[PDB]
Symmetry: C2
Subunit: 400 residues, 2 copies
């Protein structure tokens, strides 16, 4: 029974430390939040986080080549065996120069990035300290990670490195991401997305004198028309959009360079690949069609295909033990686990066939990704919410 961990003496002792040092945890939320971490600019926060992982007593603390900070809670099993990884991301959505100063308002704390995902960073440190102080023994090692690149164009670069290049790539057999404050959260699905800019070029020419030459505007417009005839099922949810366009200089000239940006997403890797392949075929057919319709005497239309965003789709089956563990603990805590799809760091693990769930840090929060983001650190709910992830984690690593 996974929820039995909640009645073990070690868990109960660890919760009492989380309780005792909740004020330390809040101080660390504030400290980390005020070290800004825009996309691709996480190094300063990673350096501070690595020092805090060392101060929590973790072993082998280091920052890897991608910029992830990590430390190990060593278990009782053989060195190098299967391990559990739990990550909270260092980056926020907010660009460099965003003023970040926490404003206290009763038990509420207002600052960009404080809930997605800085609180989770502090919650994981609190776990590591409470586990060590209470003497918890786990069967599998736990790798605590502050990872880079969950947000925006980071495109999961940190977890991609952790799980395909880094020292733990062959050991992670259970992956958790702690993202956001909702501790009832159980993200078992990953929405994938593929994004492209298509730049169409042609010879150009005077719009009167050279009327009859190919026009890349038309190949581009034809692409959009056929793109919106691609079938898209309602379930698994599958979507696409023609979203941004530009090009041309004036009505005196046939354009020689124009572009369109396209989005495609799906809950299903198979549906996403199908849309992506249909799209790429449409781009090529639209170019061929323009070169057939008008004159290529001054040169043909060509298209440059540039990928501008890439996240895999995937899902952890509801019968997987990691999901069973999260479900059972969240239920035993009196919350309602409702499995959902999202686009989170767990998408990467899912795409590798690694069992993976994204969970929440606890408490109340709102307006994530907005300049008026805030969390409530009133102790009763903040502490109780933080105890949820600890139970899920220890159920999954196993305790002695």
């Amino acid at each position: 029974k996974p929820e039995a961990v909640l009645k073990t003496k070690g868990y109960e002792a660890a919760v009492k430390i989380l309780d005792r040092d909740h004020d330390r945890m809040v101080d660390e939320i504030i400290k980390l939040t005020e070290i800004p971490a825009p996309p691709f600019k996480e190094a300063a926060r990673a350096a501070a986080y690595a020092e805090m992982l060392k101060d929590a007593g973790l072993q082998d603390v280091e920052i890897d080549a991608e910029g992830n900070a990590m430390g190990v809670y060593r278990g009782t099993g053989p060195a190098g065996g299967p391990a559990v990884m739990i990550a909270a991301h260092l980056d926020t959505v907010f660009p460099e120069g965003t003023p970040i100063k926490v404003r206290r308002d009763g038990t509420k704390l207002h600052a960009p990035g404080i809930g997605d995902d800085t609180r989770s960073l502090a919650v994981l440190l609190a776990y590591a300290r409470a586990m060590k102080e209470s003497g918890i023994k786990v069967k599998q090692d736990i790798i605590f990670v502050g990872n880079v690149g969950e947000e925006g164009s980071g495109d999961l670069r940190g977890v991609r490195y952790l799980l395909t290049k880094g020292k733990y790539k062959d050991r992670v057999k259970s992956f958790f991401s702690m993202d956001g404050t909702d501790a009832s959260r159980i993200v078992t699905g990953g929405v994938g997305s593929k994004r492209y800019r298509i730049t169409y070029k042609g010879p150009g020419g005077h719009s009167y004198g050279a009327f009859g030459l190919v026009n890349p505007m038309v190949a581009m417009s034809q692409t959009v028309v056929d793109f919106y005839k691609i079938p898209a099922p309602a379930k698994p949810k599958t979507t696409y959009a023609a979203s941004v366009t530009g090009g041309g200089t004036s009505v005196n000239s046939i354009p020689n360079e124009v572009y369109m940006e396209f989005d495609m997403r799906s809950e299903s890797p198979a549906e996403l690949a199908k849309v992506e392949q249909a799209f790429l075929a449409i781009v090529q057919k639209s170019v061929e069609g323009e070169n057939a319709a008008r004159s290529v005497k001054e040169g043909p239309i060509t298209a440059d295909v540039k990928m501008i965003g890439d996240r895999p789709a995937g899902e952890t089956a509801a019968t997987q033990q990691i999901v069973r563990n999260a479900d059972a603990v969240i239920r035993a805590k009196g919350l309602d686990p409702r499995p959902s799809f999202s686009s989170t760091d767990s998408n990467m693990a899912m795409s590798l066939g690694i069992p993976a769930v994204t969970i929440g840090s606890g408490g109340i929060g709102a307006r994530a990704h907005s300049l008026d983001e805030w969390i409530d650190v009133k102790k009763t709910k903040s502490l109780e919410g933080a105890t949820v992830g600890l139970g899920i984690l220890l159920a999954t690593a196993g305790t002695q």
Copy 2:
């Protein structure tokens, strides 16, 4: 017989003054060229030109409400009778801030706008002076005009005012524009053009969460695709283009506003109108089709139709006396007249049923509308070329 004007004592005496004061003409080319006159910013050059029109001895010199400068060479007929208008435009294609300093290079003068159309402004002043000094008597009044708005977005606003609103609008029965340096040119046809910006709007939305809503990008793309199936005759030459596009913010959203700029032109007013009506119908059908194919629950696609350019098409029949006069004088001057279509100030007069030709100022020039434009003012060729338009003009007004 029209070229008999070239053997009249008055013409021969006038040419001798053009010769004697050819150096003044060159000085006035330079002076006027160095007063920049970008589109809509001709006022400074117009004021200088009006002072020069007074100094040439013309009567009733004034700047009209649109900004055209003009003066009258009074003929021997009744006041208020039919008149000849001859115009050279004050504006150039070059935007404000273009550095303009004439560079002398042997007998060449290099400066933006010096040939199209500043040399013509100085040539018309030289005619007015030489006619007065030699005592030329003409039957019809001649209205000498430095007009605004021939180039680009000016859209013939100057000649439009002169011939539809101004004080001479009902007296001009022959219209000449002197535009460019090629004195063998005889532009008897006017290519018309209509230019539009179509702005397509919709509600926007999250590109995943709101997938299924209408997208104005698709109505716009469909417009272009069907626009390029509009039939366009080769004779009378009829053309169109989809030339400039923009809109959208990122692949995370369905766009709420996008635009496309369209060109359409023809030698024939009727062919031009057919394309324009087919285009506007396609815009409406594309909006209707998008509102049928996707959801209007957050609001429908709409299209704002904005005309951004309008120049009428037309032609002066080769049997008109004004064309016979031009043809005969150009032949008698040893040049080869090949009547042609272009887009010039004469389009306006043509569209009003006023006999109209665009002619050249004489001499050699090149790279009109480019930053490296130049003319050659070597006297033999420059003077002989300038005498062509004088003969055409006097043949048309009549001399006694």
